Design a protein around this ligand. Structure first.
Ligand SMILES: O=P(O)(O)O[C@H]1[C@H](OP(=O)(O)O)[C@@H](OP(=O)(O)O)[C@H](OP(=O)(O)O)[C@@H](OP(=O)(O)O)[C@H]1OP(=O)(O)O
Ligand SMILES: O=P(O)(O)O[C@H]1[C@H](OP(=O)(O)O)[C@@H](OP(=O)(O)O)[C@H](OP(=O)(O)O)[C@@H](OP(=O)(O)O)[C@H]1OP(=O)(O)O
Ligand SMILES: [Mg+2]
Ligand SMILES: [Zn+2]
Ligand SMILES: [Zn+2]
Lengths: 442, 384
RNA sequence: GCUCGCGAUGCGGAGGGCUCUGAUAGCUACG
């Protein structure tokens, strides 16, 4: 009992009413108090719970961190307890992504603030709390309906929020690249550097953390949250929808589940193939779950299930980031999922709104985040790049797939990841129709 | 005592009611507080002496999707008639073990060896189902009110919507038809917030009228069992009930032998039950003959107030299935198909029941009545 | 006999907010 333990420890300590959003199948409250001179916070869909979590927050931070059920504890990464406590890092990133979402959604009064899933990327450069900035923000829980896949890179295949956040992260990564390889006055203030091995690398101590308001679909969610206490298969998403099915073993096309995709990023990096031709691989340092966190299942699904992996290409590893949930977890909303996806990256004017079921925008235009637009920015970068900084002999490219193919080493990493999955008995990844990349900027 | 069917109905009504009172110390315990009551009653002879209450249950709710057990430990559906059947299953297992103890005890079982394999019921034993009301979906949705003679019967028997399969839906009112033919559920979807679909009680009883009431696991031992009559405490509409129970799928064909489309007696009672004023309780009570006390389960969690699993969850039933499996002569089995000892797979071992269920789903689909909606599979992937 | 669209009056499981009662338990204050 949070309220009871705190008001038995401390004197009579009443509070006041702060926030009131929605009603019925959607409502939200937030409470704050001052205990021993503090300003703690608590969020919940009814008043008694908002304050109760504010109480457990105040207690854990002030006297000693709360002792809870064990599966709700976070596993520290292979390296890094530097970002203060891991749980405090989670609270920080979560509040940051919520705050920027509030900014983009005219402070939650916009109709797009109704979201079933919220995702975000956060960049940090220094252990001090000030040195932290929200890179991108996104929403979405649906996928392109197979009937509307546009082949020439004009449709978004996957608008689950965490996917959209990674794609905005790439949109930010290219911009930092042009910052470095633009007017060289931008080279001092940049996240990039020429690599100590030939090519491009990130500056030391600049990290990225991933936030999802919930556990990613697929393997990291397949568990009973009210019975914490051997299968890790790959799963594919269901037609234009939330929820995943496992793959058969060794008729419409499937998109891989979000747990599977997060694994892939934990092996071959978040930058993808084209970016690999230029930058050294980049790995998320932490994963923050708004809700539905179970340390065991999350760890299984993110990297542990493919610990049978070997033959790590030069500069690749099985990335084992920090896993953690947030202190004040979100709660389940029964009901249908929106048909839209919201994306925003740092430096952007406004949010962008895509219809998740068509992958083209609310008006019918392709996205600032689809294959075609990303290729054009990649071509911009290939133009003004010194011809010797490239990592493979990517000679002036003509087609999206082939340019992707020039990332021989990235592709080696993909090969060994698929090997790890089949050798583990978890099934065979579902590769997209290859023709979905057979276009140029023509 | 040869009787008009109306006396049979009033009798079973009386019986289930009195048993409920006895368990609730004359309806005075707070566990008497119920909106709906169901019961099973067994007969062995036409005389009133030859009638015994097999089980008693109450309830009007189903589980929150956040609380589904990946280890067979939570009850999905506590509508009363669902729960009463599960109590029947517990008595069924007990009677198997009563036969398999020794031949002085096997004389007093309701089972006997079948001349076709496994066990069969002794002749002159039949089961009757009592619901104090109409079962949700097709038998109820169109007129959930006591009809008055002024208003005869259904003025629109041919609307598309008559006879459709329907689901209960998490945090939603009503029983919904199955749209776009169907949309299978997922585990990580329902966790996200996809509302959990559960087939309606009208549908489930239809299903029991084709594949029998024993489920698949029990089919591995027993021949199929059918309710001989269905008795309604209130809200009885003969045309809708008969449509809902069997007639909507009287197109069913090529069923395994000893499977059939069962058309039980349908009847309401002389003095209908009356509405229970109050909030609907969120809890369900269960009892089988031979039980010490009632069990009280929170329907929205499907576990008991302390958090314990039910003597009725998938897991407890699997355990009773294994106990009987041990004592069964490996040649007395009705299916010799072997399966690893996990709940889902074991059920697959019931090839003939599965065939029947396939014919049931096909009958509904070819009738335009929709496609059955199953739960996410991850809830049957458990062992002991 | 029905289907579909738009209305209209109703019928029939979630969330929230405020009051009433009893009880359990932790705390004070007073005589
Ligand atoms: O964010 P996503 O939608 O998951 O995008 C990825 C990405 O495609 P794009 O880069 O064109 O957006 C992958 O390419 P890389 O990032 O590795 O360069 C691609 O995999 P391949 O290019 O290796 O084919 C994969 O598609 P799939 O894994 O199904 O082939 C595809 O995800 P979707 O196809 O699910 O959109
Ligand atoms: O109607 P209920 O009392 O809820 O239980 C039934 C029963 O499941 P269990 O008896 O295994 O608990 C059916 O299984 P059988 O008796 O036929 O073996 C099962 O159907 P399947 O096992 O054929 O999948 C059905 O589940 P479903 O409705 O998904 O087909 C399930 O009912 P609920 O899922 O509604 O709880
Ligand atoms: Mg099923
Ligand atoms: Zn997803
Ligand atoms: Zn029902």
């Amino acid at each position: 009992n949070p309220v009871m333990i705190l008001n038995e420890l401390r004197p009579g300590l009443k509070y006041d009413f702060l926030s009131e959003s929605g009603e019925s199948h959607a409502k939200s409250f937030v409470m704050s108090v001052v205990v021993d001179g503090q300003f703690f916070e608590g969020s919940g869909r009814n008043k008694k719970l908002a304050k109760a979590r504010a109480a457990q927050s105040a207690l854990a931070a002030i006297f000693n961190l709360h002792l809870d059920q064990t599966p709700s504890r976070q596993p520290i990464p292979s390296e890094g307890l530097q970002l203060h406590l891991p749980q405090v890092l989670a609270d920080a990133v979560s509040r940051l992504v919520l705050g920027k979402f509030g900014d983009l959604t005219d402070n939650f009064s916009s109709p797009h603030a109704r979201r079933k899933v919220l995702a975000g990327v956060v960049m940090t450069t220094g252990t001090d709390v000030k040195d932290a900035k929200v890179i991108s923000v996104s929403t979405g829980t649906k996928c392109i309906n197979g009937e509307y896949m546009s082949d020439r890179g004009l449709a978004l295949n996957d608008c689950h929020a965490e996917i959209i956040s990674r794609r905005s992260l790439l949109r930010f990564l290219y911009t930092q690249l042009e910052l470095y390889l633009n007017n060289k006055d931008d080279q001092k203030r940049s996240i990039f550097q020429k690599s100590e091995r030939g090519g491009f690398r990130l500056k030391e101590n600049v990290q990225f953390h991933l936030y999802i308001s919930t556990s990613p679909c697929g393997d990291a969610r397949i568990f009973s949250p009210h019975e914490p206490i051997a299968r890790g298969q790959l799963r594919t998403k269901i037609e234009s929808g939330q929820g995943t099915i496992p793959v058969r073993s060794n008729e419409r096309l499937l998109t891989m589940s979000c747990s599977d995709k997060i694994a892939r990023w934990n092996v071959v990096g978040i930058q993808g193939s084209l970016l690999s031709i230029f930058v050294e691989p980049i790995y998320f340092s932490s994963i923050i779950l708004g809700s539905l966190y179970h340390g065991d299942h999350l760890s299984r699904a993110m990297y542990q299930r493919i610990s049978n992996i070997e033959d790590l290409p030069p500069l690749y590893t099985l990335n084992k980031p920090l896993l953690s949930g947030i202190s004040n977890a979100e709660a389940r909303q029964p009901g249908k999922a929106p048909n839209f996806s919201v994306n925003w990256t740092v430096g952007d004017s406004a949010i962008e709104v895509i219809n998740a079921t068509t992958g083209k925008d609310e008006l019918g235009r392709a996205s600032r985040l689809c294959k075609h637009a990303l290729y054009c920015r990649w071509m911009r970068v290939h133009g003004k790049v010194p011809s010797h900084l490239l990592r493979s002999k990517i000679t002036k490219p003509n087609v999206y797939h082939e340019s992707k193919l020039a990332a021989k080493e990235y592709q080696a990493a993909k090969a060994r990841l698929f090997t790890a999955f089949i050798k583990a008995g978890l099934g065979a990844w579902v590769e997209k129709p290859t023709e979905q990349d057979q276009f140029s900027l023509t």
